[PDB]
Amino acid sequence: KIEEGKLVIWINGDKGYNGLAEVGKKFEKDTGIKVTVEHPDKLEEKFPQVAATGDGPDIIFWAHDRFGGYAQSGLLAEITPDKAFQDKLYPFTWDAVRYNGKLIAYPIAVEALSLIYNKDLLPNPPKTWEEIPALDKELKAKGKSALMFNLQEPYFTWPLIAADGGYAFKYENGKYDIKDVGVDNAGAKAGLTFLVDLIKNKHMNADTDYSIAEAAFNKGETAMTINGPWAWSNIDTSKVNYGVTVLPTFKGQPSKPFVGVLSAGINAASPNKELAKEFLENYLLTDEGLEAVNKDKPLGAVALKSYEEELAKDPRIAATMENAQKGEIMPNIPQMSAFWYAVRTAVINAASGRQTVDEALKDAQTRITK
Ligand SMILES: OC[C@H]1O[C@H](O[C@H]2[C@H](O)[C@@H](O)[C@@H](O)O[C@@H]2CO)[C@H](O)[C@@H](O)[C@@H]1O
């Protein structure tokens, strides 16, 4: 059973659900329609379950890459924002919400990795990756290191590998070509080679992971790290006078980190599709709406141009958006799973010696296009 005459929305417990409830209240005040916001555990797993029997919430909020599987099963309705409404959000955000050409959700916020540096020991962060080997040598003369970041997860090393030419799946005409994979090209090898060279020359350690790199930076042992907005609070506590800026370039090309877009989708079984569109387009996605949510829990950078211009007064937020625009929207298709597993293995093998760069990426490329 559906509901009709009301809206039930689902959003994770780590987002600003009280603020979203407040926009829901204004909605009821204006139109008279009731809006109920819920935040159940493991909601991203429950949705495909209940939605399959024609039940669940009218609207669901979650990273866009999850909507791919939902769209595949016909769980999400096709949205119809006109050209004028689409012009209100940054163009690249609409690419993260289409499946097989159809628009299946509204972009809300944008997230991506940035370069984080310690202002006290490094007032002027490097503009290029090539500069780092030398910067590390000067800093070591005082018992400090230049950079430390997670080398165990491919999500963190990919920005560098992608810089000069690497890509997961080719995107064109709003579609991904599962046959045009770019982890085996010249650019990718140049990027990984530079990464392996860093470890051989003793600038980084092949075993460094998330906790290890985070501690080094927060203790002031290393001058920089690479992380996302989910890590700022831990830095605030450490008391390090930190900065968040654009990632370094490689061979003159910007680093290209994967982008995650918080999005709002409409249950295909909902009899309240027009109510959902009214609420999402003219209440939530306004300076007033996103403001309400942001106050409760910060959204980071947002897709709405007008509000993003206001939030950008914060240099950390301005950085997140700059790195995201220079990055690669994470693919929402089934094969991306193969990509992750194949690339993880290659990076770890080339870093440990288990395999050379040329061979590691060659095998990865072979497994993914299988
Ligand atoms: O390393 C592969 C891994 O990358 C992504 O995970 C990110 C996530 O997107 C970020 O929001 C944050 O949590 O850091 C994660 C890396 O630990 C993909 O989302 C994930 O599916 C993939 O396995």
Swiss-Prot record:
It comes from the Bacteria. NCBIfam families: PRK09474.1. This is Maltose/maltodextrin-binding periplasmic protein. GO terms for biological process: maltodextrin transmembrane transport; maltose transport. Pfam families: SBP_bac_1. The lineage of its organism: Bacteria, Pseudomonadati, Pseudomonadota, Gammaproteobacteria, Enterobacterales. InterPro entries: Maltose/Cyclodextrin-bd, SBP, SBP_1_CS. Keywords: Periplasm, Signal, Sugar transport, Transport. Part of the ABC transporter complex MalEFGK involved in maltose/maltodextrin import. Binds maltose and higher maltodextrins. The keyword Transport applies. It is found in: Periplasm. Belongs to the bacterial solute-binding protein 1 family. The keyword Metal-binding does not apply. The complex is composed of two ATP-binding proteins (MalK), two transmembrane proteins (MalG and MalF) and a solute-binding protein (MalE). GO terms for cellular component: ATP-binding cassette (ABC) transporter complex, substrate-binding subunit-containing; outer membrane-bounded periplasmic space. GO terms for molecular function: carbohydrate transmembrane transporter activity; maltose binding.
